[PDB]
Amino acid sequence: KPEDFRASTQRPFTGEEYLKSLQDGREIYIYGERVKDVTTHPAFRNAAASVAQLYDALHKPEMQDSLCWNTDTGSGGYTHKFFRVAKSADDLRQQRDAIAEWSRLSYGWMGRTPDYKAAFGCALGANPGFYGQFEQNARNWYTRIQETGLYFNHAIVNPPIDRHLPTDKVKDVYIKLEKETDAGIIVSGAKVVATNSALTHYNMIGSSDPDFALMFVAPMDADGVKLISRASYEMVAGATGSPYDYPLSSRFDENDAILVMDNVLIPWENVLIYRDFDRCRRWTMEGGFARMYPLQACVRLAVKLDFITALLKKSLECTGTLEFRGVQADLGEVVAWRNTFWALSDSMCSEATPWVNGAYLPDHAALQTYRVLAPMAYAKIKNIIERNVTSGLIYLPSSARDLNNPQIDQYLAKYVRGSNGMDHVQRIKILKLMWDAIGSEFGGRHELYEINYSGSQDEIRLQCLRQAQNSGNMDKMMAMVDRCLSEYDQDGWTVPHLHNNDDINMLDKLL
Amino acid sequence: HKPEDFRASTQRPFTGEEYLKSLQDGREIYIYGERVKDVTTHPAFRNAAASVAQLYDALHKPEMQDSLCWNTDTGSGGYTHKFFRVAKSADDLRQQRDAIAEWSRLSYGWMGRTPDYKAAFGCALGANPGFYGQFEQNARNWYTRIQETGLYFNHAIVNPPIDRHLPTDKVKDVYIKLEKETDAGIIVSGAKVVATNSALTHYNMIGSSDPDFALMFVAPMDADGVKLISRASYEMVAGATGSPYDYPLSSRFDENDAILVMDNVLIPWENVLIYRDFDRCRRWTMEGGFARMYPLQACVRLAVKLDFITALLKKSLECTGTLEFRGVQADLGEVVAWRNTFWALSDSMCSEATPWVNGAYLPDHAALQTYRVLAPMAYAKIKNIIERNVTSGLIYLPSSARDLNNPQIDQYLAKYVRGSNGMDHVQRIKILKLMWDAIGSEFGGRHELYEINYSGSQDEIRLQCLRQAQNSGNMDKMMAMVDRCLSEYDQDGWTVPHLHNNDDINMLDKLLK
Ligand SMILES: Nc1ncnc2c1ncn2[C@@H]1O[C@H](COP(=O)(O)O)[C@@H](O)[C@H]1O
Ligand SMILES: Nc1ncnc2c1ncn2[C@@H]1O[C@H](COP(=O)(O)O)[C@@H](O)[C@H]1O
């Protein structure tokens, strides 16, 4: 039904059609109050507008070569390239570039745009056989996500568990099967971290007692589905700031909601794994999604780092410190980190492997490496920024209102000039953009997001080790060590090309 | 003369035996105050020479040739190591990348200046010979020779220190300079510090007012007046006071970092490439190709070393029993991630390769710069991870294989120094001594210094990375994105229609009136 807002079944949503499709009485709360319409509400309207621009880009002729492919469904339509299964390394490369083009429309700041779960669509379409009796649901959801550009998110972090309560009363917190009916299954529970779910069409929900081993799809307007929002940096920036003062907070805020399911009916067409510990446990390795979505996440980060790199250079242009050797070296390190994530995405595509049914998966080692390095790189870049743009960021007048009151602005024009023949309005503008990138509450949330998602530092490293072991890479490395050890022993070399040291060993003489 | 004349065939590079013979040429090498007679038999160099020789042998093993070798492009009908012939596509670079890896695996990544390193200098000459003006033909001929023979070059390129308390002459004398121009070539004197493994090479490339200093040329190691002053020999010390079991890398992979001295050396004109030419000397790093090519070799070689270190760390932790703990597994996983990083950078070097001149391709340049910035950080971090996880394992190791072969000692070692996974004390001690030689022996300490410094100071590798971003136009593209962002609003609000003005929600008047 959300795709029925389209005037055409041969293309995805336009922006206007996407926005209309959101006016569906989804139950969203923020600041103790219910949200009437996310497309007009002061906490969500600009973020919605920003996603809508992504849908609009799909239909501009000049973009279509880089953003769009024909569908593979027979519809005669087109879609964003990452919404169709890749059948080669070069298909993955073109997808990489289509992701990048979308990400540039938010300067790398929206990390949960529709292309993130496009990979879940593709995973369903590439390996529907994985799902046994629900194979046909996988196929139909692939076709649907691909043709329409439906906006999914995944809500997947479990709610905390009070360990002093009884084991009676603590099952009620996880996503659980309440009841089986002919019209579908009824479920209750919660997932924390439903990033930008207020603006999506559906969410994927996934994980003894098989009543907990579920994976299914749930629409955002289903009765019983509710979002409890976190503070809105968009609304705070609108109420007490301005675009000039909070240029990113005001338009790219992706609210990290708690997703509550109270007694929700999930039709059988939306169920993918059902009371099935075996399939649930095997899905991360065999379902494909975990092996696919980090291509989008690495590219999105790399675009963000494109932005931060030049924003840092521009900030140092208006303080005047860019000329100093030590400042230049710090900027060069930021460049190297930026380059790194582009190169990892190159390797993802160039070393892609055939998977099933002709589908190709990006290089897996590169995905794990991206996950390990991104938190280190981001923390290090932010510290480089803060220790090089020093006071530039601290004293910035409170507000565009200061610039528009000539009684204040007269002093700003004199004492807050840019150091390269640049006027105070532009200097303040640049440095406020840098501040919103790193120090505003939005910037602080983004640091937390870049550091922690994908998981804890231990866990991403463990997953990296396990990929090396499971792929056979570690055993190949070990083969090399074992060969080295093979070539000598406590009596000397075991290979003929090397010289015994008996003729030069002086230990007998010394002792 | 002609070292390649030691080959029984002109249609293939040296065999190991032929290489070793080619080194018995009365090169003037000093170590420990003494002149070296024959690098192939001397206790400081003989095993390192044998290890390089194994590289030449591999080229002729049938089962290796698909990965290691191509036909030459000279018409000779011969073959060569793939990295010795110019690459003319991204896939050629990938095949070269794989051939470099196969060779590096024969020293487990520990020899960093094997012949494939300067093969990139040969290819640079063969790809852009016009660069050299009147010496273009020398470029062409050197390409052919290096390619067909597998000649072992090194570059000596760091200048000697300058006492700034002496007169302005006396400190002029000390850089490589033209002493005399003659019909038979140029006579040159000076020094280059850091001639890594030059004792085992055939030629060295030497390069950079007063145009007498703006030189680039080739010099054989047996030329009269060419001398090496060696550093301490970890090979000789390990042979003299240790054993293969005790110093399994020092004993065979030591690449002596020599000072290269030229006392009045005659360089024939056929060995000159740049002559009294500040313009060409200044432009050669960016335009000559070598700087844009050899990092492919150096990244792969490091990646192979990290393969080795990664599994050796795992094996060490199997010996102590600590591998099972979560925090140890996470540290090992980080080592894996750094290992993965350098393989991925080499993938990107090849896949994003660009057309250059005369049909040649160059590896992606941003990837080369990134490798150079990241390698010192990764290496120091890996070494610290090893030392904080294997720790006690490495400290107390009995002194010698001699302890194991004396049953009066070995009885105690067998009981108290067992491996923690049903592994006997001989294997436990063996693995951990291998790790120690990799990181804590003097060979290990030199390798840490080499991986960190090299390529240049930390500031400089970062500056070159920034400059590559700027000169390539990458930084201006990034900046166009920033300027677009800035163009979409001003001090009065949005300048684009799709976003909502906040005038309807701004509460500041109310708060402040
Ligand atoms: N099973 C576990 N054993 C030890 N530490 C853990 C475990 N699970 C999570 N942690 C740590 O708890 C912190 C938060 O992890 P998380 O809740 O996964 O974000 C991190 O420092 C993790 O390393
Ligand atoms: N022109 C320079 N200005 C400032 N520092 C330098 C310069 N050249 C070298 N250094 C520093 O001197 C140290 C040794 O550099 P190098 O001699 O290039 O290995 C490093 O810390 C470099 O950053």
PDB file of C-alpha atoms in Angstrom, chain A residues 61-157:
ATOM      1  CA  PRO A  61      17.973  12.332 -16.303  1.00  0.00           C
ATOM      2  CA  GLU A  62      21.529  13.476 -15.569  1.00  0.00           C
ATOM      3  CA  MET A  63      21.750  11.187 -12.521  1.00  0.00           C
ATOM      4  CA  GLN A  64      20.277   8.046 -13.981  1.00  0.00           C
ATOM      5  CA  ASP A  65      23.445   6.634 -15.506  1.00  0.00           C
ATOM      6  CA  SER A  66      25.220   6.715 -12.159  1.00  0.00           C
ATOM      7  CA  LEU A  67      22.273   5.992  -9.832  1.00  0.00           C
ATOM      8  CA  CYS A  68      19.930   3.630 -11.681  1.00  0.00           C
ATOM      9  CA  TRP A  69      19.581   0.296 -13.414  1.00  0.00           C
ATOM     10  CA  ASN A  70      16.729  -1.478 -15.104  1.00  0.00           C
ATOM     11  CA  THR A  71      14.963  -3.769 -12.672  1.00  0.00           C
ATOM     12  CA  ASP A  72      15.498  -7.513 -13.066  1.00  0.00           C
ATOM     13  CA  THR A  73      11.812  -8.294 -12.429  1.00  0.00           C
ATOM     14  CA  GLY A  74      10.341  -7.877 -15.934  1.00  0.00           C
ATOM     15  CA  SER A  75       8.439  -4.741 -14.969  1.00  0.00           C
ATOM     16  CA  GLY A  76      10.050  -2.494 -17.531  1.00  0.00           C
ATOM     17  CA  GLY A  77      10.999  -0.186 -14.662  1.00  0.00           C
ATOM     18  CA  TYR A  78      14.188   1.167 -13.128  1.00  0.00           C
ATOM     19  CA  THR A  79      15.605   1.372  -9.626  1.00  0.00           C
ATOM     20  CA  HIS A  80      18.651   2.448  -7.664  1.00  0.00           C
ATOM     21  CA  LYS A  81      21.506   0.140  -8.573  1.00  0.00           C
ATOM     22  CA  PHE A  82      22.045  -1.169  -5.013  1.00  0.00           C
ATOM     23  CA  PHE A  83      18.396  -2.415  -4.907  1.00  0.00           C
ATOM     24  CA  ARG A  84      19.080  -5.139  -7.539  1.00  0.00           C
ATOM     25  CA  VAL A  85      21.295  -8.171  -7.005  1.00  0.00           C
ATOM     26  CA  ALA A  86      24.858  -7.841  -8.283  1.00  0.00           C
ATOM     27  CA  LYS A  87      26.042 -10.500 -10.715  1.00  0.00           C
ATOM     28  CA  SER A  88      29.725  -9.450 -11.051  1.00  0.00           C
ATOM     29  CA  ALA A  89      32.560  -7.493  -9.460  1.00  0.00           C
ATOM     30  CA  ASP A  90      31.779  -4.647 -11.827  1.00  0.00           C
ATOM     31  CA  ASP A  91      28.111  -4.625 -10.764  1.00  0.00           C
ATOM     32  CA  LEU A  92      29.340  -4.173  -7.201  1.00  0.00           C
ATOM     33  CA  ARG A  93      31.601  -1.330  -8.371  1.00  0.00           C
ATOM     34  CA  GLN A  94      28.688   0.459 -10.031  1.00  0.00           C
ATOM     35  CA  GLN A  95      26.642  -0.089  -6.876  1.00  0.00           C
ATOM     36  CA  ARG A  96      29.521   1.397  -4.843  1.00  0.00           C
ATOM     37  CA  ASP A  97      29.381   4.499  -7.034  1.00  0.00           C
ATOM     38  CA  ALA A  98      25.560   4.742  -6.874  1.00  0.00           C
ATOM     39  CA  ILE A  99      25.720   4.557  -3.084  1.00  0.00           C
ATOM     40  CA  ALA A 100      28.365   7.288  -3.108  1.00  0.00           C
ATOM     41  CA  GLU A 101      26.194   9.564  -5.254  1.00  0.00           C
ATOM     42  CA  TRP A 102      23.274   9.226  -2.843  1.00  0.00           C
ATOM     43  CA  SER A 103      25.505   9.741   0.180  1.00  0.00           C
ATOM     44  CA  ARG A 104      26.842  12.989  -1.258  1.00  0.00           C
ATOM     45  CA  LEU A 105      23.319  14.417  -1.067  1.00  0.00           C
ATOM     46  CA  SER A 106      23.683  14.349   2.723  1.00  0.00           C
ATOM     47  CA  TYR A 107      27.450  15.024   2.707  1.00  0.00           C
ATOM     48  CA  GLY A 108      27.898  11.606   4.367  1.00  0.00           C
ATOM     49  CA  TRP A 109      25.787  12.434   7.427  1.00  0.00           C
ATOM     50  CA  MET A 110      22.714  10.268   6.980  1.00  0.00           C
ATOM     51  CA  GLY A 111      23.918   6.769   7.575  1.00  0.00           C
ATOM     52  CA  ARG A 112      20.617   4.927   7.505  1.00  0.00           C
ATOM     53  CA  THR A 113      19.190   5.971   4.155  1.00  0.00           C
ATOM     54  CA  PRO A 114      17.123   3.537   2.030  1.00  0.00           C
ATOM     55  CA  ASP A 115      20.161   2.000   0.334  1.00  0.00           C
ATOM     56  CA  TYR A 116      21.386   0.517   3.637  1.00  0.00           C
ATOM     57  CA  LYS A 117      18.570  -2.040   3.730  1.00  0.00           C
ATOM     58  CA  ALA A 118      18.518  -2.313  -0.057  1.00  0.00           C
ATOM     59  CA  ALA A 119      21.170  -4.920   0.756  1.00  0.00           C
ATOM     60  CA  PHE A 120      18.632  -6.851   2.819  1.00  0.00           C
ATOM     61  CA  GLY A 121      16.301  -6.800  -0.157  1.00  0.00           C
ATOM     62  CA  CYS A 122      19.100  -8.134  -2.344  1.00  0.00           C
ATOM     63  CA  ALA A 123      20.088 -10.774   0.168  1.00  0.00           C
ATOM     64  CA  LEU A 124      16.479 -12.029   0.052  1.00  0.00           C
ATOM     65  CA  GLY A 125      16.451 -12.023  -3.754  1.00  0.00           C
ATOM     66  CA  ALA A 126      19.822 -13.770  -4.084  1.00  0.00           C
ATOM     67  CA  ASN A 127      19.291 -16.611  -1.582  1.00  0.00           C
ATOM     68  CA  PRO A 128      15.525 -17.099  -1.141  1.00  0.00           C
ATOM     69  CA  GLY A 129      16.069 -20.834  -0.849  1.00  0.00           C
ATOM     70  CA  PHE A 130      17.640 -20.194   2.543  1.00  0.00           C
ATOM     71  CA  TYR A 131      14.200 -19.591   4.062  1.00  0.00           C
ATOM     72  CA  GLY A 132      12.579 -23.002   3.469  1.00  0.00           C
ATOM     73  CA  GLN A 133       8.811 -22.635   3.516  1.00  0.00           C
ATOM     74  CA  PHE A 134       9.156 -18.821   3.457  1.00  0.00           C
ATOM     75  CA  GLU A 135      11.264 -18.819   0.275  1.00  0.00           C
ATOM     76  CA  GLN A 136       8.440 -17.216  -1.683  1.00  0.00           C
ATOM     77  CA  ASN A 137       8.129 -14.394   0.857  1.00  0.00           C
ATOM     78  CA  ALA A 138      11.825 -13.650   0.337  1.00  0.00           C
ATOM     79  CA  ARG A 139      11.296 -13.493  -3.413  1.00  0.00           C
ATOM     80  CA  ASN A 140       8.265 -11.271  -3.180  1.00  0.00           C
ATOM     81  CA  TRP A 141       9.901  -8.866  -0.742  1.00  0.00           C
ATOM     82  CA  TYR A 142      12.949  -8.620  -3.022  1.00  0.00           C
ATOM     83  CA  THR A 143      10.719  -7.738  -5.962  1.00  0.00           C
ATOM     84  CA  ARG A 144       8.823  -5.220  -3.898  1.00  0.00           C
ATOM     85  CA  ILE A 145      11.778  -3.443  -2.303  1.00  0.00           C
ATOM     86  CA  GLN A 146      13.561  -3.322  -5.659  1.00  0.00           C
ATOM     87  CA  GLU A 147      10.738  -1.938  -7.735  1.00  0.00           C
ATOM     88  CA  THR A 148       9.414   0.642  -5.281  1.00  0.00           C
ATOM     89  CA  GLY A 149      12.458   1.740  -3.337  1.00  0.00           C
ATOM     90  CA  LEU A 150      10.684   0.895  -0.094  1.00  0.00           C
ATOM     91  CA  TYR A 151      12.565   2.337   2.913  1.00  0.00           C
ATOM     92  CA  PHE A 152      13.444  -0.373   5.417  1.00  0.00           C
ATOM     93  CA  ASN A 153      15.491  -0.113   8.591  1.00  0.00           C
ATOM     94  CA  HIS A 154      16.584  -2.923  10.848  1.00  0.00           C
ATOM     95  CA  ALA A 155      15.804  -2.723  14.557  1.00  0.00           C
ATOM     96  CA  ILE A 156      18.009  -5.309  16.151  1.00  0.00           C
ATOM     97  CA  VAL A 157      19.480  -4.426  19.560  1.00  0.00           C
TER      98      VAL A 157
END
